[PDB]
Amino acid sequence: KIIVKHVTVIGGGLMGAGIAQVAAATGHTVVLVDQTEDILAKSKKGIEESLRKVAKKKFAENPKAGDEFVEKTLSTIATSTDAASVVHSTDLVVEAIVENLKVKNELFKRLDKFAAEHTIFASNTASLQITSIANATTRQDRFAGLHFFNPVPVMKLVEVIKTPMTSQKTFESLVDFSKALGKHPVSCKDTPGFIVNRLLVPYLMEAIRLYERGDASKEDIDTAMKLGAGYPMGPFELLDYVGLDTTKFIVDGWHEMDAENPLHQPSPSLNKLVAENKFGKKTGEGFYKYK
Amino acid sequence: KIIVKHVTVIGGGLMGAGIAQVAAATGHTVVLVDQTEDILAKSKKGIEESLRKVAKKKFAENPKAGDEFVEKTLSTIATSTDAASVVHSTDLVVEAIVENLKVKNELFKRLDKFAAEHTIFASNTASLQITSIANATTRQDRFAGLHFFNPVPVMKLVEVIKTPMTSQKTFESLVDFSKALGKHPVSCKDTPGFIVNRLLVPYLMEAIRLYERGDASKEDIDTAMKLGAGYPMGPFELLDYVGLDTTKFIVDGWHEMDAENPLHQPSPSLNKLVAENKFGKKTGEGFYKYK
Numbered sequence: 233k234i235i236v237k238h239v240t241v242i243g244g245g246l247m248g249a250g251i252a253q254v255a256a257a258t259g260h261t262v263v264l265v266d267q268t269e270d271i272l273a274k275s276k277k278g279i280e281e282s283l284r285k286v287a288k289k290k291f292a293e294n295p296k297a298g299d300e301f302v303e304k305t306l307s308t309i310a311t312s313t314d315a316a317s318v319v320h321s322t323d324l325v326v327e328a329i330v331e332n333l334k335v336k337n338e339l340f341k342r343l344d345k346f347a348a349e350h351t352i353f354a355s356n357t358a359s360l361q362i363t364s365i366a367n368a369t370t371r372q373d374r375f376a377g378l379h380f381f382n383p384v385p386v387m388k389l390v391e392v393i394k395t396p397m398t399s400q401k402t403f404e405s406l407v408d409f410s411k412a413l414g415k416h417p418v419s420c421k422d423t424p425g426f427i428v429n430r431l432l433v434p435y436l437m438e439a440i441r442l443y444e445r446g447d448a449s450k451e452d453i454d455t456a457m458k459l460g461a462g463y464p465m466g467p468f469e470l471l472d473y474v475g476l477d478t479t480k481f482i483v484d485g486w487h488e489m490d491a492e493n494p495l496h497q498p499s500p501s502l503n504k505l506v507a508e509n510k511f512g513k514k515t516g517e518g519f520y521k522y523k
Numbered sequence: 524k525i526i527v528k529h530v531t532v533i534g535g536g537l538m539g540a541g542i543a544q545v546a547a548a549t550g551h552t553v554v555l556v557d558q559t560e561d562i563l564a565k566s567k568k569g570i571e572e573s574l575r576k577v578a579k580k581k582f583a584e585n586p587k588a589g590d591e592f593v594e595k596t597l598s599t600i601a602t603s604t605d606a607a608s609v610v611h612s613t614d615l616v617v618e619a620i621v622e623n624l625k626v627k628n629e630l631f632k633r634l635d636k637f638a639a640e641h642t643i644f645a646s647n648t649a650s651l652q653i654t655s656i657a658n659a660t661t662r663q664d665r666f667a668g669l670h671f672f673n674p675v676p677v678m679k680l681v682e683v684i685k686t687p688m689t690s691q692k693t694f695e696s697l698v699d700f701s702k703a704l705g706k707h708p709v710s711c712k713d714t715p716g717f718i719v720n721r722l723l724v725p726y727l728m729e730a731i732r733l734y735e736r737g738d739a740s741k742e743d744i745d746t747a748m749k750l751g752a753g754y755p756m757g758p759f760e761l762l763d764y765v766g767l768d769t770t771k772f773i774v775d776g777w778h779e780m781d782a783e784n785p786l787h788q789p790s791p792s793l794n795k796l797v798a799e800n801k802f803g804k805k806t807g808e809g810f811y812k813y814k
């Protein structure tokens with residue numbers, strides 16, 4: 233069983249920059265990867281920006297301490313535009329790029345060739361099939377899903393996804409990596425939505441349906457779930473938070489895999505806004521208007 | 524427009540005792556009604572022990588007031604084994620008895636005769652057609668739904684369920700009373716499960732199904748939702764908390780009136796536990812072993 237020390241993170245976006253941040257903070261040598269030096273540049277600036285916010289509150293007393301913390305972490309995150317140039321000596325690759333299967337498969341098929349023999353490949357994919365992406369390579373026993381949640385620096389959960397071919401050796405290492413990252417790992421078969429989303433997304437859709445059916449206003453449904461179920465955010469607040477686009481995307485997927493299914497029936501209200509570009513907190517408006 | 528001051532709570536079990544207490548505690552004259560004296564005695568007993576728990580904490584410095592508060596609250600709660608003799612001049616009737624729709628309509632039918640003209644009628648049923656109950660009286664415009672959540676003295680949400688016949692005045696009346704109790708009211712049509720249970724119960728079933736499917740363990744699923752969604756309890760912990768038998772009676776109810784909807788399909792595991800009388804925390808065993 234190998235102990236992850238060098239981690240290559242492919243995708244300097246929302247989920248990837250977060251993943252690079254935690255790994256560096258927790259003592260892993262990291263190489264962040266994205267299509268351009270400009271994009272990379274911006275990502276590290278965001279990782280830095282996120283780090284100081286963590287510094288000035290983890291070291292509110294001693295600013296210098298917080299500075300050191302920031303500089304050291306940021307300094308153990310290198311940046312490259314071609315993952316193939318660094319994976320030959322990395323222990324784990326965590327992929328977090330476009331949620332497109334063809335692109336991923338193309339990515340891994342290539343990396344498969346450069347990466348050392350012990351290197352493990354993990355996809356932070358939210359809706360695709362891990363087993364699929366895994367089959368674009370000849371290294372499935374070393375392939376699995378390592379699903380994090382936004383925002384990564386804060387969310388403590390991480391789902392370790394096991395394809396039928398992933399090996400125990402590979403699994404345990406991914407669990408130990410998760411624990412090393414300071415997160416709490418949990419196991420789940422390679423099934424759509426894994427756990428969190430499989431149980432969360434259908435819930436939100438139902439909320440939109442009760443609203444659409446005119447059974448209650450959004451404001452009252454949100455209140456009801458916050459006060460009567462103890463949820464942090466009402467379903468509509470949560471929808472605007474995770475992104476209407478993101479949701480719509482995932483549900484079209486599940487619907488398309490099984491159209492006769494009523495749980496995945498589309499949503500006019502959701503569709504209109506996705507159309508009107510109102511994506512939620514992202515764009516400054518979703519179901520609710522934001523500053 | 525009517526202001527509730529005298530409240531008649533029929534049924535002193537879990538929800539009933541709680542409604543009585545919150546009522547009495549906020550200055551509402553209360554008459555608690557149940558089938559037998561022994562029952563009433565014990566029901567009033569629990570309100571006392573629960574009120575003191577509070578007293579011991581809130582009135583640490585001033586113990587004198589602690590007692591005063593408790594005693595005044597209790598003295599403001601009368602008891603009776605004859606519902607009809609109490610409603611002669613009451614403002615509101617909050618029903619909270621056996622969830623079987625029969626006994627409900629029989630009880631309400633008989634009282635419609637003795638209650639004053641202005642008196643409003645409300646059911647706390649979690650899953651029953653409010654209308655089926657209203658139409659058991661000739662007081663429909665004064666008949667609504669008032670859904671509370673356990674423990675009624677802590678949960679602040681109150682679902683005010685309106686039927687097509689319910690008058691606006693009877694609505695605005697139940698809203699104020701809700702506020703007067705220190706609760707926060709939301710509006711919803713008489714759609715099965717209303718809001719909260721409508722969105723929570725099916726989600727809890729999906730968690731069980733994900734388990735029965737061998738996709739993940741009960742423990743991880745809970746962690747998943749806790750750390751993944753920020754929920755207070757996992758669906759399994761929550762299930763054992765709300766009582767398995769309860770849950771089932773609700774899913775069965777919806778299943779019958781929609782024997783095809785896949786979201787209400789009965790669950791093996793769930794039916795086996797109900798069978799083995801392992802209803803959850805209130806049994807020491809449900810999905811987990813307790814006490």
Ligand SMILES: NC(=O)c1ccc[n+]([C@@H]2O[C@H](COP(=O)([O-])OP(=O)(O)OC[C@H]3O[C@@H](n4cnc5c(N)ncnc54)[C@H](O)[C@@H]3O)[C@@H](O)[C@H]2O)c1
Nearest residue numbers: 243244245246247248266267328329330331356357358382
């Ligand atoms: N949006 C969310 O909240 C969320 C939560 C969990 C998981 N996910 C999943 O995680 C992945 C991460 O998505 P994200 O939200 O951070 O998106 P993002 O758009 O913020 O980031 C993706 C990054 O991928 C880069 N990229 C694209 N193609 C590439 C390639 N061939 N080689 C290298 N880099 C490439 C892009 O330049 C971009 O910066 C997706 O598969 C998604 O389904 C998203």
Ligand SMILES: NC(=O)c1ccc[n+]([C@@H]2O[C@H](COP(=O)([O-])OP(=O)(O)OC[C@H]3O[C@@H](n4cnc5c(N)ncnc54)[C@H](O)[C@@H]3O)[C@@H](O)[C@H]2O)c1
Nearest residue numbers: 534535536537538539557558619620621622647648649671
């Ligand atoms: N359990 C929950 O989480 C929950 C949440 C919301 C609403 N409710 C609803 O509230 C109601 C209260 O349920 P509960 O959990 O307290 O049950 P319960 O059995 O503990 O309490 C009911 C009380 O009703 C009495 N009763 C029954 N028939 C009667 C009659 N004809 N006349 C007088 N008293 C009678 C019983 O003796 C008992 O004391 C139910 O209709 C239920 O659906 C329960």
